[PDB]
Amino acid sequence: QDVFLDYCQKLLEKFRYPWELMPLMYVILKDADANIEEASRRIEEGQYVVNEYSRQHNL
Amino acid sequence: QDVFLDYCQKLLEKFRYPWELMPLMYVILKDADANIEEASRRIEEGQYVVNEYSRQHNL
């Protein structure tokens, strides 16, 4: 549990998120079975999809 | 895909997050197969766990 929250903080820091988003890092990493690489890839996919939805809709 | 992003925005708004966190709503809701109730429950679990780790560690 303690180590898991350590990975959560690593993920948080990689993406320059504030501590208030630790709950979201918890969910994403738990969903990915504590696979930090896969969690990172997933966040990058979200960032892409959101960015392009915005660009392709005048945002 | 368009409707999926509307659900992501509904989840974003429920938890009072700014637009910048849409990528995280995308991941969590995708992981939950677009089940918004389950996405909510999971974020609530993360909120509990993080809050409890903080309280039980002087934060």
Curated annotation (Swiss-Prot), chains A, B:
Entry's localization field: Nucleus
Superkingdom to which the source organism belongs: Eukaryota
Extra facts: Experimentally shown to bind zinc.
Function: Controls somatic sexual differentiation. Binds directly and specifically to the FBE (fat body enhancer) of the yolk protein 1 and 2 genes (Yp1 and Yp2). This enhancer is sufficient to direct the female-specific transcription characteristic of the Yp genes in adult fat bodies. Involved in regulation of male-specific expression of takeout in brain-associated fat body.
Protein name according to UniProt: Protein doublesex
